[PDB]
Each structure stands twice: as structure tokens, then as C-alpha cells.
């Protein structure tokens, strides 16, 4: 009855292994000894399988799971086949509505721990002691596309963290840029409808490159700041591990003395900031639409845990009006040059889920889920968010008991007088379902606010004004933050912004929309506007050329913290290199290559023209991970070609193209021995060039140079060379 | 208050226009003069917009749709803002569950007309009169991926037609291959779970290239026939217009005399059969994941209506047991050499929907929706389908009144005693909600069966047997039909099948699964098995090399109707050519090109290195449709390069790569004058070669030669030359 192979090769090892070395697996089978309070609390609903009988949902053992019940073995199926009907009924109802936005997302378990007690600024229990370990569940996402859309689209990314604290669930529901597109939540359906596939034909998926999006942008200049970020390489991250996170809104921290401090939340990636380039990102949506989901899961299985440092920008209440912009305007960022990010703790993602649907798809995050020690502000985008995230779950998760779905359950106590609702799990024994009551001595009871374990009380902010549907005049400035962002980018980052706008606007069919957007760009920076205009065949008018640029932000000419690359921070651990094999590899080269990569935590994939094995010059049998076409250069950070029988691959079109694609995408390339003959396909002269490592053999210096290139992510100096490369 | 441009360039012309000439639009605005009975019946629910006030859903005019109501213009949002809450509530609940399978689909309205009355074989009213026009709504789909997944995946395609007949809705719910993967509906959740993204991590989207799919296949040889089709180029159609359709199951036709005839349904595409090649299809999921949806919509907007001829394979009842296979086995096809397809009528798709969600997403097709004159058989896959398609709508469409959703409503009368349910639209006035009743004189009343307008009565098939969960032994043959399919393919189609298996199995991480699948291939054809094994580094054993091939199918060693290309059926109308411009095009070349393409109904897209315009040698201003990168060769059927200032583009990497990609993908290429210098980038010698049209100018037979190549779809003779091309 055993269908597994006798050698046990069906089962992945329950130990950390590099990407591709083992089949991936549910987290509790891959890493059974990785534990936290939330993961342990899910044990009551985890279901095994080994050595159990196959049954109906009612516990009846099934004898024949291959056939329907029929009148004769060639006869009609009988209505009395309850086993068939139960199985098909469950199948028929598997799908639930996807999230209205951020439907495409990938999630993992982990933990957060503060660096020190923050009691002087907040009474939030999870920040009260460096010994406080708080389990987290984090979901990263795109915004526009459906749950089945591609990972490496150009889009904003979501970054949502559920903190299972001892005083309640706190959800920090943020994005990978520090501002949003719009100012008031009332416009959210308009903006989302504009960016989403257009309603007649439901095109395009996962793209803002269409008329309705740019129509809205051209008519709503408040959007321009976040549009700038989306058109930059920020819109195409290399990995969820290599992007920043931001809460966007100004919130409040409330301490035990009742003092409010304004705060904006930041996540700083330990792996550094790194993004793809557009042609690579777009092609990768075809070669591997699951690239980010896969890379996150495989990093965790390898022990390359994503880590993010939590940071606070803190502004005293008395400083509310000390900036050129309104702190409550979510289209404005707070420059780190003006208000530094103070690091307060670290989050580590160290276990994948067991079941994607049960844990990821059904997870409900909501920024109104705060705890004592935190509070809101009047940011009019945040204010409306507070309504949406509870409301939407009534259809998405089937009713008001969504907190009883296991992933959503608090790990701390919860007791109240709420009852019933669809799929009610908790069986209340309280004689009372109301308060005040005497029949249960008024339990469960209210708790006054206090320094710890106290009830929630809102900060008593003064409100004065008339009931109005009116935007604050302080919000009516749209160009200075886009300009600060533009001026803070490197020259190659600016080029990529220009190319982003140019590519997207080329896909807008109505030319006047393109012209209106270019006019908006002329209010931000005329170099940007002229460069985009040239790519669109648009000529700026003399009036447009005379638009006065917007003022600096509180005296800032630039803020390098807004650039992905101006200040180096990259780390190579967890990156991956393609090694292009031949049928008689120089084993000495491969030994030195793999040894150096291992010392730095860099993974490798051995590629060839077919699957199976090749044998090196010394008899070493080399297992092949993928073909050149099966694992394209898009999926790796650098390419190494060792020596050997180079004639075997010298005329292989896929092998030559592998290097040309990597070259065009600015990736480091290293060539040993006779592999240097491949310089011809990338038009590199005999004297070489920066970004192409070459030597007689692979060695320590050879690998040191390559790993130095990898630490810099891409070879930006190659950009002037790639336009003549046919790739 | 007008935001539209004064020149009116926001509004697409309400007349047929070629792809890209105008913005696309809702069908009733693009083609207001196109009508049918179903389209007319939807007018009661169509909603306009021009010249109307913006309101709440309760009809209250909105004054300020830009702001929430707050206490002061910098204050908190008020709970009494019912306008905000209604708008956000509707947004928060927009999504409904996607279809369990076939979630990704594209749909259009049209009509069907039979060629002559079929009353000798069926009393079905829609087939009773050549003047009887039946409106249709057709949805084409993939199978595996979500609603946001890509079009040009390797997968089976769905082809579902809703016929709004005078005697009820008939849904013909078929696929683009003539068999299914499994024999008994009880296994459907198993097969679908195996092909769908794996449950731990929800990878991969839109792909069968993963362990669990091939695990199931290797353990269920009944799947091998449809697997063969999926691995062939059938799995990657060029367009929904260029694929076949099949009902798969044997059904019955019932005539007025009560005689039953077995029938299998077929759709023959007027545009012929045409598919992509794998590398092109995969890259196209990245460059345009909406390619098939877009092509269908734009063909209809151009007046190039998709057309399909309905055909029947007809088998007398007394011939049930005269074949080598069981007629009720849905893993077996009926070879057209044994039972020809008899043409029945024509279907034309001539109008796009107005709202994708309302009409496409909410449409419910179900093969149990038959009409008098049709009936089922005991095919055990069909039998279980009959349960599923009603059941699934209870969650997907919110309850049992899904037939009241406008797209689903019959156009003929419907009256019964059913009442209530969620979203009940119909307000019944019958004093009775039961029968028999006297209080309404028993109306609505049963109708006896008869030759026309009679009640439904099942064919009184004899049933004899014990109640068993047992597969018919006649179904227990798995290899002859895969072999017949294999032997019917051209040599290049066979190579593409080999490459499909090889690519997919290379993505299976557990090697023993690959080995088990190769063993199954050895039971089908040893040449196929050896070629796949070689690409996987697997050596067949002596026992595998000695497996006796399966028998022929009723004496057939081939049936050319199973090949896409063995018998040419290509038509060029609706195809598209890229024209690569330069900054001083030879206008005489372009005149001849566009004239010849227009005469054959072939579209063109003028491409350059930027948007805007270029000016030809004679001063003609040429509008640019897209950049080389913006509209890659993947999206066209052929490439033409006119003469002019060729030096302007000769060193353009994108322009050179455009030709190399098209060359690798076997597309016709035509080069005029100095454009012949591009032969160097595709390694074509001065002598030229078949598939590369060249001449001093585009006059003479230049365009005839190119259009002849296009009629043959791809340049199969070029295959030996593509492996050296780095593209
Ligand atoms: C008033 C409506 C509204 C507005 C203005 C916003 N959102 Fe939102 N957001 C939703 C309404 C919403 C929602 C419809 O409630 C979602 C979709 C499904 C869900 O559970 O919540 C959601 C989902 C959602 C997710 C995915 C959570 C997950 O992984 O499940 C993230 C990361 C964000 N949002 C982040 C933001 C950010 C950073 C915003 C700007 C500051 C923002 N949202 C504005
Ligand atoms: C017992 C389960 C079952 C089985 C054996 C099949 N299907 Fe099915 N099919 C469904 C259960 C189902 C479903 C779950 O009921 C769907 C999904 C959502 C829906 O409305 O119907 C569906 C959808 C669906 C669609 C999409 C309709 C649309 O566009 O909305 C097509 C074309 C098919 N199927 C075709 C087939 C074919 C050709 C089959 C094999 C002969 C087949 N199905 C077997």
C-alpha cells in the first residue's frame, strides 16, 4: 500500500537547507522545533495525516475513494452517494472572496523583541521590557492585482504585521513607501478603481500603465508624491527582505503620565535596500510569477530569516506646526534629516505557515487594532481606514466571528458580552450576556485606564470646528515632496524614474492624458519633465519651461535616506548565483567558487543544457539544478562561468543569452579561464571592464572581486553600454 | 466643470476600428447598433451616466465627493457621514468568490443559427429551423489559475456557451481538447488539488510544472491522454479564435419519435488552428498577461468577429459497443476517421460586455442545463458534474436566485412554485406556492412531452446492475489514445511535446517522480520516452525498452485531424504585423506594405524607439503606436522592416533583439532595401533562406510572399537554426 519511494527521497529533511536542495514543506514539518507562543497556541487546530484512515468529515471511514456509487459499473450515479456529495460539496465551496486590495500576498510567522523599555514614551506592554517577546504574523503584498497575479509587478508593496501582545492584538498595517497616493479616505474607492483593471474589459492586471490611472493622477496632483516612488525602482523590489516598511500615518504614543508623542513607524531591512530593473521585473512576472513568494519561503527554510528593525520618528506635541507640511497629511513624508528614525526593536521572520489558505488567506489585519499606549490622530486617510478593515471582513471571512479563525485569535484573554453570529466557535457559559448585570456579579468587568493592564481610554485631544466636508488648506501643496524625492536619487535612479513614467505613459491610449501628466511633472522638476516629454514625442511650451520649481522642504536640498543606493547598506547573505556548467568542468574552479560563496552565505544553482549530472575533470559528479532556460538569469543576482570544456557551451544560444540578459540587467559576471571567450557575446574588449570579473582561474582574489560586486548589488557604470546589447 | 479635452479625443468612435486605433469601450457604447434578443432584454438593468447627478445608492445628490465630514477641516471624521460609509461599505464588499476552476476567463455576446432543421435527430427547438437565431454568451478560460492569473499559460482552455433558447437555457460547457484527465467525478477534487498551487505555500500559479501534478499523473495513467494534449502546442493557443472546442462527453439527441442518438459536440474555428511556442507563451505571460482577453475584445471591436461552426459526431444506439474503447469513457476520443463531424450551424461573437464583473464574472454555466431534445449518458464524469454546477453557485453567487442575475436570466418564460432565497428579485403574485392547487386552478401547469414546446422527460434507458463503487473494466486502457495522438502529430509538433514534458519534469524537485512519468511514457511510445529521458539525464532500462506498444485504435495508426498543422487551415484575417520604423522611412515601401495588409484584413502596429511621430522621406507624418520594448515581437505574427535611414536603428539593441526574438519564435520576417542588413543579427547568409522575405523594395511579390508565410502561421523549417541564436 506504500506509494512513497523506498529510499525516502519524497520527504524533505527537517533541518535548514538552501533553496532547491529539498522539496519545500509546511512549516511545522520543516522546522518542528521553531516555536513561539502563537505557533504553540495553534497546535489545537493542526491536523496530521500519517497513519490515519481516510474519512468523511463526519468520521466515517471511506473504502473506495476512486469511484462514485452507480447502478452497475456502467450505470448512472446514485443520489444516495453521500461520500461523493460531501467531497464535491466541500470542493465546490473552497473559495472565499479575495481582499479588495492587496489580494496578492505572502506571509510568515516570527517574533519581535524591543531593545529597551519604552515606558517613558508609551505604556504599550509589548514595548515595556527588552525581555518581552511578542509573536508576529507578517503578510507582504502587492496592491492592485488579484490573488493569482504576479509578484514582480511595478506596484506599491504592503507590509502588515500582527503583534500578538499580552494586552491585545496590535496590527501595524503599512506599505513600502512613506506616503500614500491620496489625502482623504473618501477618495479611496476612486483611486483604487482608477488603478485597478478597467471595468469594461478587466484589463490590465497588476499594472498602473493604463488610461484611467493616469487620468486620475493628472486630475489629482496630491497623488504625485507616491507616483514618484512607484515609478522609481522602489516599485520593483528584489525581495520582500530588501525593502523598507512604513506606517505612513502619524500616530500617537501615550505614556503612563498621559503625555502624547507623535510617532511615525519604520521598518529597516537588515538585508538592505535592493530592487530589480524594469525589463528584468517585467520578464520575471512571466518566467516566475511567484518569485517573491518563493524567495521568502525559501529564505526561511534556509535559515536566512528576514529581519527588520522597528524605528520611530518621534515629534513632541508642541512641535506639531513646526514643519513646512502638515504632520497629518499622508502624502507628506517626514525627512530623516529633520527627524531621525530611532531604532527600538527587531523583528525576525523564522517559520512558514502550514496551510496557505488557513493562515495567510484568512488572516485579517486592521490598523484600528491598537492597544493601550497607542492612539490615532486626525489624519483623514487613517480616520476612514478605521471603518473599512472591520467592515470588509463580514463578507471576506463570512461574518463577525473572524477573530475566532485560528490565525486571528489573540493569545491573551478575551471576554465580553458579544454572542452568536455565523460560525460561532466560543461557547459562552456566562449567565449574563449584558452589563451591567448582577446575575454574574457584573463579570467580565471594565478596567480603568492605568500604567499597565489598564482599559483603553482615548487621548483627550481638543476638537474645535464646524461640521464640514472640507480639506485642510495646509494639505494643498503637491510638488515639494516629489521634488525632494527626485533630487535625493542617484543619476541612475533618476534615469529609471524617467523610464518608468515614459514606459507607463506610452501605454496610455489617449494622448492628452500623457500631456497632462507631463505638465504636472513640469511643476516638480523640469529636467524630469523634459526627459519624459522627449520619450513621448512631446515638446514643452515656453510657459511650461518657465514654471517656478516648488520650495525646498524646511531648507533641505536632498535627503539621501530617500535613495535606495546612495548610502551603501547591502549584504550578500541569502543572494544566489547561477553557475553555468559544461560537460568537463575544471573542478578546481568550482571548489574555490563554492567555498567562497558558502563563507558569505550566498547560494548557488548549477545550470546546464539538460537535467541529470555532468562529471568534472577529476571525476566529481555534479548534480544539475535546472537548465539555462528553466532558471533564467532573472532569478539570480550574479553569474559565474568556470573553465573546462567551454566548447560544449560556446555555441549554445541559451548559455550565451544567459550572460547577455544578466549583462543587460547590470548583474556581476565572473569568467574563469576559457570562459573569458564569452566576453565576445557581451561585447567586452580584451582589456576587460569594471563589473566583469576575469582571471586564468577561480581563486580567492577572483571570488573576492565578485562578492564585492555583489555587495554593491548592480553594476550601474555599465548602463551606457547596455543600449547596444540585443537582449 | 468639463474635464474632457475640447477636441473630444477622450471618446472612442462608435464604429469598427482596428486594434489600438481607439480606446476600448463598453460594448453598448462601442457598437450601439449591434443587437440580439438577449442584449435587448438587458436594457432594463443598463445604467447610463452622462448628464446625471452623482448620488448615493438611495438617490440623494452628493455635493462634495472629495471629503469626509469632520469636526473642523483638520478634525476627526464623524460617524454621521453616511455618504462616506455607504461608498466605503460598497467598496469593502465588491469581491465575490472566484470560480473553483476556470477562474480566469474572457467572454462575449453573440448569436447561433443552424444550417438546417435537425428534427430528424433532435426535437431541440434551437436546432429546428434555419431561420431561428439563438443569442449566446460565451466564456473562454484557463483552468488552474486565479482570476488575476495570466492568459498565455500552458493549460487546458475552457469554452462555455450559454444558448438562450425559446425552450430554456442550454449550456454547452466544453474544453479545447476532446477528452478530460480523469474518468470518474469522484476524483475531480484530487486531480484539481494536484494541479493547483500546492497547499503549504500556494505555488505555482497557472502551471502544472510542479511535483504534485506529476505525482498524481504518474499514479493515475488514465490522465496520460489529456496530459499529452496539454504538453503539445494545444496547451498554448495563439488566440481563443484559433482553438477547437469539444463537449468531451457523449450526450444523447432525442427526436420527436423518442429515438436516441449518441452525440459528441464540436466547435470548429473559422480562423483555423494556431498555437504559440513555449518560450514565447511563457515570456508573453510577463509582457502581457492579458493577451488573450485583449485579443478577443479587440477583434470584436474591429468587426473581426470570432466564428465557430458547431458540429456533431453521431453514433446510433446500436453502435454503442462497436469501438475498441467505451463511448462513455471521457478519457477516450472518437477519431474523426471513424465518425466524421457533421456540421450543424454557425456561431458568431459580435459584441463585448458593458461591465466585466456584472456579465462575465457573475455568469453561471452548467452542463446540466439541457433542453428537450437533449439528454445525458452514464459517463461517470458527466454524471458528477451534474451535481457540482448548481451547488457551487450557492456560495459563488450568494444563493439560489442566481438565475435572476441579469446575464443568467432566460429570455423565454419561466414560472414555478419556488419562492424566497437571498436577493429574491421576482415578486410572485400566484395565490398558490404549491401544486397541485385549486386556488390558482393549478397554474403554472405541467406540460406533457411532445414534438415541440413539450415538457422534459428523460430517455427511458434500461438500467441493470448492483449498487457498486466500481470502475467499468472497459475504461481500463490508458495508452492507445495517447499513442494515436502522438503518431498523428507532425515531427515538429512531436518535438514540442517532448520539450513540454522535459521542461515540466525538470521543475519537479523529487527525481523519482520524473522517473515514474518517463516509465509511463515508455508504455505510450519509446521514441517519446527516450527523448524525454535524454533531456532529464535518465537512462531507460532494458525492460523499459522492451515494453510492447499499445494497440492501434480500430485499425488507425494516425488521424490527421488530431494535429494542429498537418492539414493547413490558417487564415490571416485578424493577425497583426509589427512594422519597425526609422526616422526617414521610405514612404513607397510603407504604402505597399499597408495596402497589402489592409486587403487581407491583417493589422499593423508602427513601432519606433520613442512615442510621438516620425516623418517619412516624402514628408508623410507617421504616428507611432508603441516602442520596440513596449510592444514586443511576442505580440505579433510577423515583422516587416521598410527601408529608409536604416542607420538610425541599425545599432539599436531593442530593434535588433525584436528580430532575433521573432526569428527564434519561427515568425515570418520581411526586409526591404537597406533593412536587409539586419540579416547579420539573425545569422542569415546573403543567399537568404525560406521564411525571410527580402527585396530591393516592398513592391512586387514582396507582400504576397510574406502573406503566404503568414497563412502557414510559423516557419517550421527554421527550427534547426534557432538553437544557435542567443535570444
Ligand atoms: C478606507 C479604505 C482604505 C484606505 C484609505 C486604505 N486601505 Fe488598506 N485596506 C483596506 C482599506 C483601506 C481594506 C479594504 O479594508 C483592506 C482589504 C482587505 C482587508 O482586509 O483590508 C486593506 C488592505 C490593506 C493591506 C493588506 C493587509 C493584509 O495583508 O491582509 C495593507 C498592507 C494595507 N491595506 C495598507 C494601507 C496603507 C499603507 C494605506 C494608506 C495609508 C491604506 N491601506 C489605505
Ligand atoms: C464534479 C466536479 C467537476 C467536474 C468533474 C468538472 N467540472 Fe467543470 N466546473 C466545475 C466542476 C466540475 C465547477 C466547480 O462547478 C465549476 C467552477 C465554477 C462553476 O461555476 O462551475 C466548473 C467550471 C467549468 C468551466 C468554466 C465555465 C465558465 O466559464 O464559467 C468550464 C469550461 C468547465 N468547467 C468545463 C469542464 C469540462 C470540459 C469537464 C470535463 C469533461 C469538467 N468541467 C469537469
Amino acid at each position: 500500500d506504500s506509494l512513497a519511494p523506498e529510499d525516502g527521497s519524497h520527504s524533505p529533511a527537517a533541518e535548514p537547507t538552501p533553496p532547491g536542495a529539498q522539496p519545500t514543506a509546511p512549516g511545522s514539518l520543516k522546522a518542528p522545533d521553531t516555536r513561539n507562543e502563537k505557533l504553540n497556541s495553534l497546535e489545537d487546530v493542526r491536523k496530521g495525516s500519517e497513519n490515519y484512515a481516510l474519512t468523511t468529515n463526519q468520521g466515517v471511514r471511506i473504502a473506495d475513494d476512486q469511484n462514485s456509487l452507480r447502478a452497475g459499473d456502467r450505470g448512472p450515479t446514485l443520489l444516495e452517494d453521500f461520500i461523493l456529495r460531501e467531497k464535491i460539496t466541500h470542493f465546490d465551496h473552497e473559495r472565499i472572496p479575495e481582499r479588495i486590495v492587496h489580494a496578492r500576498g505572502s506571509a510568515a510567522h516570527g517574533y519581535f523583541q524591543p531593545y529597551k523599555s519604552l515606558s517613558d514614551i508609551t505604556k504599550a506592554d509589548f514595548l515595556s521590557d527588552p525581555n518581552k517577546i511578542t509573536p508576529v504574523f507578517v503578510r507582504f503584498s502587492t496592491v492592485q492585482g488579484g490573488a493569482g497575479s504576479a509578484d514582480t509587478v511595478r506596484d506599491i508593496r504592503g507590509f502588515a504585521t500582527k503583534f500578538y501582545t499580552e494586552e491585545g492584538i496590535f496590527d501595524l498595517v503599512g506599505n513600502n513607501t512613506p506616503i500614500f497616493f491620496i489625502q482623504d479616505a473618501h477618495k479611496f474607492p476612486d483611486f483604487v478603481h482608477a488603478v485597478k483593471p478597467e471595468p469594461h474589459w478587466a484589463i490590465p492586471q497588476g499594472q498602473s500603465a493604463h488610461d484611467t490611472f493616469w487620468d486620475y493622477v493628472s486630475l489629482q496632483p496630491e497623488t504625485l508624491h507616491n507616483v514618484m516612488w512607484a515609478m522609481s525602482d522602489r516599485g520593483i523590489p528584489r525581495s520582500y527582505r530588501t525593502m523598507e516598511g512604513f506606517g505612513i500615518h502619524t500616530f500617537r504614543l501615550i505614556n503612563a503620565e498621559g503625555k502624547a508623542t507623535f510617532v511615525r513607524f519604520h521598518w529597516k531591512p537588515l538585508a538592505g535596500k535592493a530592487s530589480l530593473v524594469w525589463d528584468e521585473a517585467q520578464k520575471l512576472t512571466g518566467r516566475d510569477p511567484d518569485f517573491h513568494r518563493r524567495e521568502l519561503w525559501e529564505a526561511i527554510e534556509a535559515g536566512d530569516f528576514p529581519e527588520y528593525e522597528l524605528g520611530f520618528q518621534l515629534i513632541p506635541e508642541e512641535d506639531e506646526f513646526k514643519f513646512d507640511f502638515d504632520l497629518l497629511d499622508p502624502t507628506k513624508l517626514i525627512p530623516e534629516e529633520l527627524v531621525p528614525v530611532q531604532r527600538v526593536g527587531n523583528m525576525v521572520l523564522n517559520r512558514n505557515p502550514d496551510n496557505f489558505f488557513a493562515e495567510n488567506e484568512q488572516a485579517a489585519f486592521h490598523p484600528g487594532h491598537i492597544v493601550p499606549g497607542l492612539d490615532f490622530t486626525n489624519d483623514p486617510l487613517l480616520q476612514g481606514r478605521l471603518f473599512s478593515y472591520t467592515d470588509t471582513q463580514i463578507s471576506r471571512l463570512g461574518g463577525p466571528n473572524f477573530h475566532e479563525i485560528p490565525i486571528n485569535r489573540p493569545t491573551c484573554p478575551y471576554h465580553n458580552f458579544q454572542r452568536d453570529g455565523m460560525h460561532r466557535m466560543g461557547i459562552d457559559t456566562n449567565p449574563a450576556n449584558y452589563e451591567p448585570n448582577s446575575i454574574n456579579d457584573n463579570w467580565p468587568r471594565e478596567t480603568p485606564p492605568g500604567p499597565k493592564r489598564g482599559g483603553f481610554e482615548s487621548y483627550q485631544e481638543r476638537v474645535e470646528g464646524n461640521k464640514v466636508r472640507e480639506r485642510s488648506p495646509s494639505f494643498g501643496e503637491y510638488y515639494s515632496h516629489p521634488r525632494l524625492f527626485w533630487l535625493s536619487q542617484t543619476p541612475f535612479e533618476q534615469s529609471h524614474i524617467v523610464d518608468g513614467f515614459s514606459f507607463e505613459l506610452s501605454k496610455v491610449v489617449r494622448p492628452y492624458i500623457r500631456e497632462r501628466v507631463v505638465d504636472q511633472l513640469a511643476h516638480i522638476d523640469l529636467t524630469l519633465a523634459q526627459a519624459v516629454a522627449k520619450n513621448l514625442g512631446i515638446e514643452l511650451t515656453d510657459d511650461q519651461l518657465n514654471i517656478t520649481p516648488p520650495p525646498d522642504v524646511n531648507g533641505l536640498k536632498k535627503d539621501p535616506s530617500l535613495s535606495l543606493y546612495a548610502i551603501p547598506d547591502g549584504d550578500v547573505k541569502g543572494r544566489v548565483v547561477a553557475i553555468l556548467l559544461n560537460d568537463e568542468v575544471r573542478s578546481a574552479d568550482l571548489l574555490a567558487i563554492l567555498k567562497a560563496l558558502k563563507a558569505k552565505g550566498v547560494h548557488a544553482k548549477l545550470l546546464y543544457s539538460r537535467m541529470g549530472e555532468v562529471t568534472a575533470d577529476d571525476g566529481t559528479v555534479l548534480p544539475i539544478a535546472a537548465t539555462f532556460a528553466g532558471a533564467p538569469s532573472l532569478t539570480v543576482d550574479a553569474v559565474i562561468v568556470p573553465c573546462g570544456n567551454i566548447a560544449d557551451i560556446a555555441d549554445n544560444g541559451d548559455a550565451n543569452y544567459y550572460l547577455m540578459e544578466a549583462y543587460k540587467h547590470l548583474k556581476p559576471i565572473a569568467l574563469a579561464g576559457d570562459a573569458r571567450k564569452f566576453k565576445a557575446t557581451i561585447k567586452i574588449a580584451d582589456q576587460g571592464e569594471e563589473g566583469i570579473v576575469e582571471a586564468d582561474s577561480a581563486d580567492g582574489s577572483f571570488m573576492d572581486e565578485l562578492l564585492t560586486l555583489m555587495a554593491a548589488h548592480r553594476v550601474w557604470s555599465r548602463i551606457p553600454k547596455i543600449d547596444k546589447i540585443p537582449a
Side-chain angles (χ1 to χ4, degrees), chain A:
Chain A
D1 290 335
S2 186
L3 301 180
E6 204 174 285
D7 67 4
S9 59
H10 63 301
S11 192
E15 65 181 294
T17 55
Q22 296 284 291
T24 56
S28 74
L29 305 186
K30 180 66 180 183
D33 301 322
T34 298
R35 296 164 81 264
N36 72 38
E37 178 171 341
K38 177 65 182 180
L39 287 169
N40 299 342
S41 74
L42 293 171
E43 194 58 38
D44 68 334
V45 298
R46 284 192 184 94
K47 262 230 185 277
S49 58
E50 294 176 56
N51 303 307
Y52 283 113
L54 173 61
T55 67
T56 69
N57 296 329
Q58 304 290 328
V60 171
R61 292 191 183 216
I62 294 168
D64 186 354
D65 195 47
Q66 321 305 322
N67 290 291
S68 300
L69 181 71
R70 36 178 156 272
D73 67 23
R74 221 167 155 271
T77 300
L78 299 186
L79 190 60
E80 74 188 73
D81 190 347
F82 64 99
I83 300 170
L84 169 70
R85 277 185 293 94
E86 184 200 78
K87 186 182 181 180
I88 302 298
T89 295
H90 204 279
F91 174 80
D92 284 346
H93 300 289
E94 282 182 8
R95 298 293 176 266
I96 69 173
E98 70 181 18
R99 296 159 170 77
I100 316 302
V101 287
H102 301 255
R104 177 71 192 177
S106 303
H109 292 270
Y111 69 99
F112 167 84
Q113 192 165 2
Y115 292 159
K116 68 165 62 166
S117 173
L118 297 186
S119 300
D120 61 329
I121 60 173
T122 177
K123 62 178 172 179
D125 183 74
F126 79 106
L127 298 167
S128 67
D129 195 295
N131 82 347
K132 284 274 177 188
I133 294 158
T134 299
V136 302
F137 189 66
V138 170
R139 187 170 178 279
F140 302 104
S141 53
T142 63
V143 176
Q144 194 259 36
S149 65
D151 281 340
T152 65
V153 295
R154 180 185 298 287
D155 204 354
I156 301 302
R157 299 311 193 278
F159 189 155
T161 304
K162 179 172 294 299
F163 293 86
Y164 302 89
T165 94
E166 298 179 18
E167 299 191 354
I169 287 177
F170 164 47
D171 293 332
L172 205 170
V173 185
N175 281 346
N176 71 333
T177 66
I179 71 284
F180 201 62
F181 292 99
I182 62 166
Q183 296 180 336
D184 189 309
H186 194 78
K187 303 295 304 168
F188 194 69
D190 297 304
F191 173 76
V192 171
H193 283 186
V195 76
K196 282 270 184 178
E198 304 196 9
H200 56 299
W201 66 345
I203 292 183
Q205 197 71 213
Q207 300 159 67
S208 57
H210 60 107
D211 290 47
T212 59
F213 174 75
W214 292 102
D215 194 37
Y216 189 93
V217 170
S218 75
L219 298 168
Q220 294 284 271
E222 71 197 53
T223 64
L224 290 162
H225 191 193
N226 213 27
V227 169
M228 289 293 309
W229 286 72
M231 295 302 111
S232 81
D233 290 349
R234 292 271 182 168
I236 47 177
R238 158 69 173 80
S239 162
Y240 294 139
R241 305 181 301 104
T242 65
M243 70 189 193
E244 291 181 309
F246 305 91
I248 294 175
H249 311 291
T250 304
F251 290 84
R252 289 177 167 110
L253 300 181
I254 310 295
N255 75 9
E257 302 94 304
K259 176 171 67 59
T261 303
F262 292 119
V263 62
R264 288 202 184 183
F265 298 119
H266 289 248
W267 288 116
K268 172 179 187 303
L270 181 62
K273 295 172 290 189
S275 287
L276 309 175
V277 303
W278 169 245
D279 179 59
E280 170 196 19
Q282 188 192 39
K283 205 192 300 189
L284 186 49
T285 66
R287 302 300 196 196
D288 185 8
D290 302 306
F291 179 76
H292 284 160
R293 183 170 292 178
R294 184 190 313 274
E295 197 258 5
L296 172 64
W297 193 283
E298 293 179 338
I300 291 172
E301 287 204 348
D304 299 324
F305 302 142
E307 298 192 42
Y308 306 86
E309 185 168 77
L310 183 61
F312 292 171
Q313 286 180 298
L314 296 172
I315 300 182
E317 185 175 66
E318 80 216 85
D319 289 0
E320 183 172 5
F321 303 107
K322 290 187 180 174
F323 303 87
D324 281 354
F325 52 94
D326 196 312
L327 289 186
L328 305 186
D329 181 347
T331 67
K332 302 291 179 299
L333 59 78
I334 309 176
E336 293 182 44
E337 285 295 319
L338 301 185
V339 180
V341 174
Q342 302 185 233
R343 58 199 180 188
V344 299
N346 191 49
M347 177 166 70
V348 180
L349 304 185
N350 65 358
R351 235 217 52 190
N352 292 313
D354 285 307
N355 184 265
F356 183 99
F357 177 88
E359 292 169 84
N360 176 325
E361 189 68 27
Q362 299 190 125
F365 302 83
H366 177 77
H369 293 167
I370 60 167
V371 293
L374 309 178
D375 213 335
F376 309 117
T377 66
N378 293 333
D379 172 321
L381 190 66
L382 171 61
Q383 287 273 314
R385 288 180 77 199
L386 302 184
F387 170 79
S388 172
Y389 295 72
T390 299
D391 175 46
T392 195
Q393 317 306 342
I394 301 305
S395 63
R396 193 175 67 92
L397 302 177
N401 291 310
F402 61 87
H403 67 288
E404 300 188 313
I405 299 173
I407 191 67
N408 295 325
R409 301 184 304 201
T411 59
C412 61
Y414 111 81
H415 296 86
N416 57 46
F417 301 98
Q418 302 182 30
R419 301 286 183 266
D420 307 353
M422 193 65 80
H423 209 107
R424 179 64 178 193
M425 298 290 296
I427 301 183
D428 288 285
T429 66
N430 194 337
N433 64 354
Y434 59 96
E435 68 83 13
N437 70 78
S438 70
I439 69 169
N440 202 45
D441 211 2
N442 209 24
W443 293 106
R445 287 187 192 169
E446 293 154 295
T447 310
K452 180 172 183 176
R453 298 295 192 276
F456 188 88
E457 184 181 271
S458 294
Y459 180 66
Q460 296 181 37
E461 174 174 23
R462 188 66 181 178
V463 179
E464 292 185 7
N466 303 82
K467 298 190 179 177
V468 292
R469 289 176 170 87
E470 180 187 336
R471 202 75 61 82
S472 179
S474 63
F475 282 43
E477 195 288 316
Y478 311 123
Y479 307 118
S480 68
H481 283 46
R483 178 170 182 78
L484 170 68
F485 179 81
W486 168 258
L487 293 175
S488 301
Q489 307 308 303
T490 68
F492 57 90
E493 282 177 310
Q494 289 180 342
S495 178
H496 292 175
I497 292 169
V498 165
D499 292 348
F501 278 108
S502 300
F503 179 91
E504 294 238 343
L505 290 175
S506 79
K507 302 310 187 74
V508 169
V509 177
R510 294 167 178 89
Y512 75 90
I513 294 174
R514 309 181 200 142
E515 295 159 6
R516 293 175 173 187
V517 175
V518 165
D519 188 70
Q520 295 282 10
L521 300 185
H523 291 77
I524 295 168
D525 180 84
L526 280 167
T527 303
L528 163 65
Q530 284 178 107
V532 175
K534 192 182 67 48
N535 289 333
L536 301 174
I538 295 173
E539 164 158 83
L540 297 190
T541 69
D542 289 334
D543 284 358
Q544 290 176 309
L545 290 168
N546 286 323
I547 297 170
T548 304
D552 295 334
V553 179
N554 285 98
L556 287 176
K557 293 195 188 72
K558 56 162 70 178
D559 191 328
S561 67
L562 302 180
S563 169
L564 290 162
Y565 303 117
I567 305 304
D569 69 348
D571 168 65
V572 304
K573 187 182 181 196
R575 300 295 186 102
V576 60
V577 170
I579 304 181
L580 307 189
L581 300 180
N582 61 81
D583 67 354
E584 196 169 26
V585 169
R586 184 176 178 181
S587 56
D589 281 352
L590 189 58
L591 280 181
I593 294 162
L594 295 179
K595 176 177 188 172
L597 295 180
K598 181 180 183 184
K600 292 287 290 160
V602 178
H603 307 298
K605 62 176 65 170
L606 304 186
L607 304 184
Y608 191 52
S609 54
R610 56 160 172 81
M611 294 293 287
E613 301 170 341
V614 294
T615 42
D617 59 353
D618 73 335
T620 305
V621 173
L622 304 177
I624 298 158
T627 66
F628 302 134
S633 84
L634 310 176
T635 69
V636 301
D637 297 285
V639 188
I640 303 171
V641 190
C643 191
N645 183 27
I646 293 299
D648 177 42
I649 57 168
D651 306 324
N652 182 304
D654 282 353
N656 282 283
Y657 187 71
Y658 206 101
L659 297 168
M660 300 182 72
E661 188 184 62
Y663 187 82
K664 177 185 178 183
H665 296 155
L666 314 175
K667 289 168 181 176
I669 293 168
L671 307 170
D674 291 343
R676 292 170 289 183
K677 300 181 183 181
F678 279 111
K679 285 159 62 173
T681 203
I682 52 176
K683 305 175 188 177
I684 302 319
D686 299 4
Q687 40 272 16
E689 72 178 25
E690 297 299 292
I692 301 300
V693 179
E694 50 177 293
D696 282 354
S697 74
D699 55 61
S701 166
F702 180 93
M703 289 305 298
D704 280 348
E705 296 176 29
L706 175 87
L707 290 158
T708 296
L709 293 177
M710 292 188 67
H713 183 51
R714 300 289 170 91
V715 187
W716 313 115
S717 63
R718 187 188 294 162
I719 289 173
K721 298 287 206 324
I722 65 175
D723 290 341
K724 42 172 290 187
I725 297 296

